[PDB]
Amino acid sequence: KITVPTWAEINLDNLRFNLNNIKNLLEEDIKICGVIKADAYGHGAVEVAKLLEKEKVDYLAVARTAEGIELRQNGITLPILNLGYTPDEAFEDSIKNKITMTVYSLETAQKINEIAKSLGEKACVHVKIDSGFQPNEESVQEIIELNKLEYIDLEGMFTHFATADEEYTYKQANNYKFMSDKLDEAGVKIAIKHVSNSAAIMDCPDLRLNMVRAGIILYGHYPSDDVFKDRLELRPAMKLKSKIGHIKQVEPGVGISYGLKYTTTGKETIATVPIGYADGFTRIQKNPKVLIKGEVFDVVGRICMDQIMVRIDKDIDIKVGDEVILFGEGEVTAERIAKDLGTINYEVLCMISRRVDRVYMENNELVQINSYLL
Amino acid sequence: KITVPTWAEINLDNLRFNLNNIKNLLEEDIKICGVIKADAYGHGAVEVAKLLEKEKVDYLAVARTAEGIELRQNGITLPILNLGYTPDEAFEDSIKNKITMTVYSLETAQKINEIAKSLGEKACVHVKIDSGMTRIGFQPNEESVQEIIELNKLEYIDLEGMFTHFATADEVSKEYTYKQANNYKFMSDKLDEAGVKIAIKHVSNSAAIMDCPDLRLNMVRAGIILYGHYPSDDVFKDRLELRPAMKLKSKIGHIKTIATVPIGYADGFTRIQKNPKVLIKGEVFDVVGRICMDQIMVRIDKDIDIKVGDEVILFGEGEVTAERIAKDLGTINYEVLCMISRRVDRVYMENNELVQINSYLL
């Protein structure tokens, strides 16, 4: 029923579990924006969006106009915020698809306004403060003007923390206050003020404002080791899986894979797994591992584009087509791969390729298989 | 008419340039297999495949059944070979879609034969020999010869082909490569003796194609070279002149001197990079700070007057190359190419005009 040899299994109940724990943290009056940029950090933005919709979150965030359109094309009705850059030639598509756009300057708000005027639609925007608009009086007047524009709905105001996962944050926090304050003095309403990312949500309870932006934590992962984990319980939602393609006993003294960078010592059982660097299992890894029936085993030799080799050095019952876990259970994790790489968990999650089908589970049953090729 | 902030421009003319130069290497009767696995090494398998049909190659090679099916769904009619593993669950789809399957055990062949019999269709297979890569395939011994002899008897199987793959054909020393070919020859000779016919015999990859003209046999497998890239720095690059086909591009989004560019690690411009660079207006600039998920910051330290929307080239022009990122990362050009994410639209060019845009999202 899964006909692909390598897939990403996404447990939807884990997303629910994570979100419910997030919600416990917050007062009822604080809105949640689920951050689903970069294909929901590799989990599949459309399917994740559908779930978030069921679960009644308030906003969804994306990084690209297309990511938003993709959502509209799939029946998503929630408000959507493009956190990232909107190029000028995409203003109209945004307005037509009801994508809230982030704006950094008065000038650009004016461009947007003119476009919405011709569509006869008010364009919803959030203003970004860089703590974007510098936090100063000159900007304060700029916004006051922006708000005058006939075809702009200035719904939101936000900033983003550099270091909430490690206070500089609270410096950044000050600047935004300087903003929120001056704008109040002037009666500019701003329905949604938001500043909190995942780390802030966790460590910084004073920073709830009108909404929080929940990203890495929705997926079941921590933004760093530093945050108060004790605070929030998480379950990772993705498992990268494969099957055993082949097995053989290799004689001693035999090179394996390209460049022959691993040489057998002793007669070794070697398994071949149909996952590679083109799947997002990067060649860069110095110490790659897999989980097979509760055991970790080393990946040996260079990682190929579509295949890897594994030394089975334990007694276990295995055959061709047995399941292999690459990350998300036991001791194989995205954090571990990330640490070996010298990068972060977010990146490992994002790397997972186009050809890797997302298989959605719910109530421990497979409910949906998404192919990006077919 | 491009609406995305970051895109991959694929120059079809360059694919043609590469292919023709590859053809010039070869005598008339040697078959060409175009290797388009991993979405044609990030270039877009469907479009590349269409180009290959138009230019008339003999075979297409994929790594997964689904890769084969995608091509069929877009009207590709050339023979397609799945180089690697086909799991049991995909046998029927393979047969129905005329995806030729790599086989390396009699047992799987028997299973394939059964599914095929039930469909009432013959399955096409190529036999893989493990000659020293130690990856997949039959060990090169007599027991395996017998096994193949038996396989050949299966009524619902067409044993079309037999191949191996070199571990080291791109290195300066060819000794292992020749050793691997010797291992293949033993099998080929023994089977010939036993009367197993075998139409398409193949061993050569891009490096073998370049460096080993004595290894043509029936067919050669061209991959990285198709895309205008060398397999290593050690091949005889003077034999084959190549043009890279892909340019990864963005445009300047914001300026303050630091330009912010809306490309990030999520696009496959990896964070791991310690010396990331970009090309703007003919000059190279440093990417500063950490690479973000969706953007990077660039330092403009020269006086050409960049403005918002000027083009930024990540690789494929001038001094910014896939190889240069690869050097930095301790990987290879193949991986950098494969890295480009689903959200990065593939924009196809020909005669310096845009002829097609593919969105993987919309």
Residue numbers in the entry:
A (entry chain B): 3 to 133, 139 to 173, 177 to 384
B (entry chain A): 3 to 258, 279 to 384
What do the authors of the reporting publication say about this deposited model?
The first is the structure of the enzyme in complex with the PLP cofactor (CdAlrPLP). Uniquely, the CdAlrPLP crystal structure is a tetramer, while the other two structures are dimers. The CdAlrPLP structure gives the highest resolution data, but it also has the highest level of disorder and lacks several residues in proximity to the binding cavity and the dimer interface. Key disordered regions in monomer A include all residues from Lys258 to Thr279; in monomer B the disordered residues are Ser133–Gly139 and Glu173–Glu177, while in monomer D residues Gly197–Ile200 are disordered. The CdAlrPLP tetramer is a dimer of two almost identical dimers, with an r.m.s.d. of 0.274 Å for the superpositioning of main-chain atoms of the dimers. Each dimer is structurally similar to the homodimers of CdAlrK271T (r.m.s.d. of 0.288 Å to one dimer and 0.361 Å to the other) and CdAlrcycloserine (r.m.s.d. of 0.397 Å to one dimer and 0.511 Å to the other). Subsequent peptide sequencing revealed that the minor species corresponded to amino acids 1–271 and 272–382 and that the two peptides resulted from a cleavage of unknown nature at position 271.
